[PDB]
Every structure is written in C-alpha cells, then in structure tokens.
C-alpha cells in the first residue's frame, strides 16, 4: 500500500466534433487513484478575429477489465499464472490509426482490447443519441480513417433541431373497436399501456433508466457501463493579434488559448482495469441560415401563435423538417418536436452577411446539407464544417498540452525487491 | 441605430455667410427676436457648396442660440474621416427630406473595407419570461 507516481505530460490535438482520449492509465484491484490535470487548450489559428468561444468537456471513466474481456477475464484472474493470455485486437497498419484511444499504433499493429472496447462502451453509454445505432466495430482496424485517428463524432449541443424526440416517436396510437361499439374500459387500459410505451421512448430507453423509474437502482456492472468518475466543462477564450504592416494594418487573427484544471478526487479501484480521460471540443451551432420557427410558418394558426395551454399539453408531437428551420434547410430531414416548443426557447441570430465570411465558426450551411436526407448524420458534428475558418490545420483543428499529476496507492514491491533475488 | 454627428469642413457660421449684415441679424435685439416670423434660407447659406435649391425655415437669430462644429477645410479630402466631405444633400438633388435622412454612402469613403458593412456587433441577450407554459414533458406525454 505504497505510492506510485504516474504523473506525466501530454501534447494532443484533434478535430472538432470528435471525442478523443487524452490519457489512460492501467489500474489494479485495490488501487486508490487520484488525478489532478492542468494545462491549456488552443485552436488552430483563425482567419479573422475571435467570434465565439468553443465549449470544452473533459471526462474520466473507470472501466473494469471484466467489462471488456468478459468471462474470459474472470478465468484469466482465476487461473492465475496458468491463464491463457488475453487476445489483442488489430489496427490498420498506420501510426496514427489508434489515436482515438490515445496511443500510437505499436510496432505489431495491435493494441490491447481494453483500450478499444472501453472507448466503444464509453461512446455507446453516454455520447451517442440513445436512439442511434449502437456502435459495434470489432477491431480498431474496422474503423474508418477519420474515426480511428480523431475519435468518433458526437452530438451537437442540444437545440430544437439537434435534440428532436427520437425519430420513432408515436404520433398516434390506434385502438381497435368492434364494428359498432367501443370498450371504454379497454380504452382506459389502452392509454395506460401507451403511457408506459411513451415514457420508455422519451427517456427510458436504457435498462438502467427504467429501473430508476421504479425507484430502484443498478450497479455499473448490471449493464456493463463505464463508470463516470469526473466531468469538467469550460469555455475556450483567447485574444486577437493585431496586424501591423502596410497591408495587414487593421486586420486581426484570433488566437484562442485557455488554461484549465481537471481534477479527479481520490477514487477506489475495486478491480483491475483502465482509467480513461477524454476530451471533446465543440462550437455552439450558430447559423446565419436558421430562423425562428414562427417566422417560417406560412399559415399561422391559433395553435401555433396563441400559446393556449389547454392545447399545448394535449396535442401530439409535431413533425416538421429542417426546411422549416433553415432557408436552405433540407426538406427530407424530418424531426418530431414538442408542440409550441418554439415558445420555450429562442435561437441564436447571425445576420446573413457573415454567411460567407471565412473565419467564423458558424455553420454557414444548414446542418446536414452535405450528408443527405439523414437525421443522424446532421445531428452528429461534422468537423469539416469548420475547415473553412482555420488558417491551417498543421495541428488539426484544436490541440492542447497539460500535466497529468497522478498518485496511486497500491501494493507494489520496490524495484529493489524485484531486481534482488535473495 | 449608429450615427455620426454631421461635422463638415464645408459648413460655416450663418453670420459668416451673410453678405449684408443687418441690425436684425447682428444686434440680437430681443424685441425683434421674439416677434418676427420664421426666416427662409437655403443650404447655400450654410455650406460653401451648399445647394441653393434646398430651402429651410429657421427661427430668427437661432444662429445666436447655438454654435456649429468646425473642421479645417484641409480634412475636406482626406479619406478616413467620418466627416461629411460634401454639403448634405449634394447628391440627392434639391430635396430637403433626402438631405435630412442619413445617406450611408456618405461614409463609404472612410472605411478600409465593408466586409461586414459599416458597423457590426455581437451581444448576449439574456431573456427571462414568466408565463403559463406546460412542461415539455406534459406536451409529449399523452396520459
């Protein structure tokens, strides 16, 4: 039960919408793990001055190796010094193609399963929309160029068009009825049943959440969810650099440079596993093309304008399309929003003029404009959408460097003891 | 609404422009100032290149109630100063309304480049509104 010093530096960088691992540490059952990270985060040089600050999120999860290797792990630990070695997973034969899990692809082109599987588990349990397809690549080598190097894509910050009710939301519930009569008792049950269905669709799609519904609870082992140990978030601001020569005089370049601390309070590691810490930089989806929902409606009806409570609480969801929110909105992208939601929140505004000035991190094209009539593709952040505003991604879009001070108490014979025989 | 006070290297004190200075103009005799009718004069009487077709009706001895800003005629042609380097209404014709209303082009001259028009701004609008509004949960839930 002595101290092991695992502190270390980390220089990293990535694409906008994608979730990248910035530091992982293997731990052992019985370990007491504490982590205090501190550093600075920056963005590649901007074409113009500063406009809006990006929002940065840092996470640190704990994942039991058992969650990865399954029964195979249990045997491993059980059989002890007789265990059949754990298998490695494969990566594409390229240095960077392991980037998502924070490591260079080693000489043999394969990395420990716990890195890959954890990243997956983390993504599937907290980052993707609950209704989106569960991410299930088997090997880092099954990942595509972008994903493998920069991490998976995550959802845009929540707004009316990026947080629609799950696409399969019921818009009407049918109930059969005998040719001339209706069982009012059945109708009653019908509603009840519906209620359970809705609650589920709207917010209890995950087992754990259903059980919470009953006022019960579930261990993280129940559904194999990575354990979130610490979540930090902050805005990334900086300064402008003044141009001073004959032609650059009166010009500006935004240099974003933000300092930040991410500290995990002493945590007890019950079983062997990994402590992964990842980052995610995003820009609120402002767009000179989005307009208030009501500004777009052609026939304004009492139900739209009035804001009559009696109606707002008993109507079904409303199906509308991106065309109804952005001028160049794609009509093929349908979303189901809650009635009179446009009266519950206001959207950001950008004069159409900024629409074509390179250097602003605004979405100068309605979301999903180049991914086709596909909702998921519009919701997930497309990092290219930002290529336009950077002088040059020599270090991708963002980048950072920080010191990770890690102290871990654990049973560990001194190096002297290891190297000495008698 | 962003505006620039209409300073102009071409405007001069009314009295500097009068050709025949009369007792009524100079004296500033109260007895007169309170009982005479308005005075009709033209932009020509206020700016060197003033348009004579633009007539205005001012109050007697008003020039004695306020002083005008001054800009040495030298700045008159230096690009970069938001001064009206041309008597107001100089390019809109003998039309008063057109002279009074601010002509934004009058300023094009002093900007390196209107990539973002002439002005621009960004701000956070914190709005809080109390109102009768069922929760989103209530809207999306049937029963």
């Amino acid at each position: 039960r002595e101290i092991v010093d695992l502190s270390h530096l980390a220089f990293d960088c990535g694409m906008l919408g994608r979730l990248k691992t910035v530091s992982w540490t293997p731990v052992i059952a019985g370990d007491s793990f504490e982590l205090d990270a501190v550093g600075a985060l920056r963005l590649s040089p901007l074409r113009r001055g500063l406009a809006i600050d990006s929002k940065v999120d840092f996470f640190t999860f704990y994942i039991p190796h058992r969650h990865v290797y399954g029964d195979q792990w249990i045997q491993f630990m059980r059989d002890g010094v007789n265990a059949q070695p754990l298998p490695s997973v494969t990566c594409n034969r390229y240095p960077d193609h392991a980037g998502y899990v924070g490591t260079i692809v080693p000489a043999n082109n394969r990395i420990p399963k716990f890195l890959h599987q954890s990243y997956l588990n983390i993504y599937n349990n907290y980052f993707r929309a609950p209704w989106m397809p569960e991410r299930t690549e088997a090997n880092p080598s099954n990942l595509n160029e972008d994903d493998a190097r920069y991490g998976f894509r995550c959802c845009h910050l929540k707004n009316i068009w990026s947080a629609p009710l799950p696409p399969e939301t019921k818009l009407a519930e049918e109930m059969g009825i005998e040719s001339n009569s209706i069982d009012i008792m059945g109708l009653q049950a019908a509603y009840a049943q519906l209620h359970t269905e809705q609650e589920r669709t709207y917010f209890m799609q995950r087992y754990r959440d259903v059980i919470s519904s009953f006022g019960g609870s579930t261990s993280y082992d129940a559904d194999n969810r990575p354990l979130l140990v610490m979540h930090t978030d902050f805005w990334a601001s900086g300064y402008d650099v003044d141009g001073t020569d004959q032609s650059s005089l009166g010009q500006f370049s935004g240099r974003v440079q933000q300092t930040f601390k991410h500290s995990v309070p002493r945590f007890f590691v019950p079983e062997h596993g990994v402590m992964m810490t990842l980052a995610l930089i995003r820009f609120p989806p402002i767009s000179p093309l989005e307009h208030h929902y009501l500004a777009g409606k052609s026939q304004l009806t009492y139900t739209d304008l009035a804001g009559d409570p009696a109606l707002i609480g008993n109507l079904p969801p409303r199906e509308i399309s991106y065309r109804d929110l952005f001028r160049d909105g794609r009509s093929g992208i349908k979303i189901k929003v809650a009635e009179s939601i446009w009266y519950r929140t206001h959207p950001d505004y950008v004069n159409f003029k900024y629409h074509d000035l390179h250097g602003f991190p605004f979405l100068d094209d309605a979301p999903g404009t180049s991914t086709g009539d596909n909702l998921q593709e519009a919701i997930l952040v497309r990092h290219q959408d930002y290529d336009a505003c950077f002088q040059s991604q020599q270090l991708l879009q963002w980048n950072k460097q920080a010191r990770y001070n890690v102290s871990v108490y654990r049973h560990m014979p001194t190096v002297r003891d290891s190297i000495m025989t008698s | 609404l962003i505006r620039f006070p209409p300073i102009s290297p071409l405007e001069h004190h009314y009295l500097a422009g009068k050709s025949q200075l009369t007792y009524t103009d100079l004296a500033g005799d109260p007895a007169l100032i309170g009982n005479l009718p308005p005075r009709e004069i033209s932009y020509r009487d206020l700016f060197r290149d003033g348009r004579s077709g633009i007539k205005i009706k001012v109050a007697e001895s008003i020039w004695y109630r306020t002083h005008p800003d001054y800009v040495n005629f030298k700045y008159h042609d230096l690009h970069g100063f938001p001064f009206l380097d041309d008597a107001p209404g100089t390019s809109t014709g003998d039309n008063l309304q057109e002279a009074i209303l601010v002509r934004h082009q009058d300023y094009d001259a002093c900007f390196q480049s209107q990539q973002l028009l002439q002005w621009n701004k960004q701000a956070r609008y914190n709005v809080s509104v109390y109102r009768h509004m069922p929760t989103v949960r209530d809207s999306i839930m049937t029963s």
């Binding site: 999120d57 959802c155 709207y202 917010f203 995950r206 609120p284 | 914190n126 929760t135 989103v136 949960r137």
Partner: peptide, 24 residues
Amino acid sequence: MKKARRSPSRRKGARLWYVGGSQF
C-alpha cells in the same frame, strides 16, 4: 464582452430535451 462570445446555457427553467436518455 465576456458572455457575448459564449452562447448562453438556457439553464433556467425546466427540461426541454427528451431524446431517449442521457446524451452528452
């Protein structure tokens, strides 16, 4: 000009986004 760079949080008020569960 501190807040003006960062899009508000809309933290005041009730819950607006139901998307099936927790989404970061």
